[PDB]
Every structure is written in C-alpha cells, then in structure tokens.
Design a protein around this ligand. Structure first.
Ligand SMILES: [Cl-]
Length: 186
C-alpha cells in the first residue's frame, strides 16, 4: 500500500498510488488531483526500483515543494505506518495527542483531539470528533468548520499528519511516527 496525502493552501487530496501507474497533480481539471492556483505541475511515477517520485525526486516520508500560495506537502504512507486500535471498553471518550495521558500518544501532534460517543456507534453509525480552533481537522478530505464534527463508519479523518478510519470496533490509523497506547491493538 502507498497512500499519498497532498496538502496545499488548506486543501487536502488523496491518491492510492498503484504499481506501474503515473499521475499528475496540477491546476487542470482533468489531472488526477486538481488544485486551483497551484502554479506547478507534479508528475508522480516510480523510478526503476519502484520508488515513488514527484518530478523525479523520491518522496520517502514527506516531500515539500513551494507553490503559488503555500508549500505543497506530499506525505506518503505504507503498511508500515498502519495500526488498528479497539475503542475503550467502558469510557465513552478517547483522546489522540502528544500528552502522556492521551489514550493514543503520538509525539508529533501539536494538539490532542477527542473521539467520543462510540459506545452507541452500533446504533448511530458515527462518532464525534472534537478539536480546538487551532487544529485543522478534515473528514473525507474536507476541512471542518465546527469544533465538533460527526464522523461515520467508513469515513476518513486527517489531522496533524495522521490518518484515521472510523470502524464499528475501533479506529484504523496511519502514522509515520510511533504510536504509544493503552488501548488494545487489533
Ligand atoms: Cl483514504
């Protein structure tokens, strides 16, 4: 698996890079990924050893190229960054953040977020994510305005470099940095 997250001027995009294929990120509406006022064209393809590159530069974990209105950040995740965690058995809140007391501790995070209401997820089909005004949260690659947002089963969340996928029994996560947790790893 090679999932590329593209960030530019608070816009967020995603591509699942597949072996042997080529992609384009540009202002063109026909491109694989279209970003308005990008001012650059980025071709994604593998070198001869199969390593993904952006305009012939290996991406590795993260690659940044300046664009018209902001830096364009490409973050590439692989199965090595994947983990699954079960929701707490009885508490109805769960936190992900850089603090020693967060349920899922990830040092690279600037602020923590709260995931709640999963105890009734079998019935509602969603959880709520709470964040502060200084934390950008995207749900299915759309920046959220409100501080508390609903995330249904199957939805993808992106916040401060980490990807989350809401499921009935817990969360799937993609993080390039180690995750320490008191939660059960599924
Ligand atoms: Cl996704």
């Amino acid at each position: 698996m090679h999932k590329l997250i593209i960030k530019y001027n608070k816009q967020l995009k995603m591509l699942n890079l597949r072996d042997g294929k080529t992609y384009t990120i540009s202002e063109d509406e026909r491109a694989d990924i279209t970003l308005k006022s990008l001012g650059e064209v980025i071709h994604l393809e593998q070198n001869n050893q199969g390593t993904w590159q952006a305009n012939h530069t290996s991406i590795n974990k993260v690659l940044v190229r300046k664009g018209d209105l902001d830096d364009i950040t490409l973050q590439l995740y692989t199965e090595a960054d994947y983990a699954s965690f079960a929701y707490p058995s009885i508490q109805d809140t769960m936190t992900i953040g850089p603090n020693a007391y967060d349920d899922m501790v990830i040092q690279s995070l600037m602020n923590a977020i709260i995931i709640k209401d999963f105890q009734s997820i079998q019935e509602s089909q969603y959880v709520r994510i709470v964040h502060d005004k200084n934390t950008d949260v995207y749900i299915n690659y759309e920046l959220q305005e409100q501080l508390t947002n609903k995330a249904y089963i199957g939805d993808h969340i992106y916040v401060e470099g980490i990807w989350l996928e809401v499921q009935a029994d817990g969360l799937n996560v993609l993080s390039q940095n180690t995750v320490a947790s008191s939660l059960i790893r599924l």
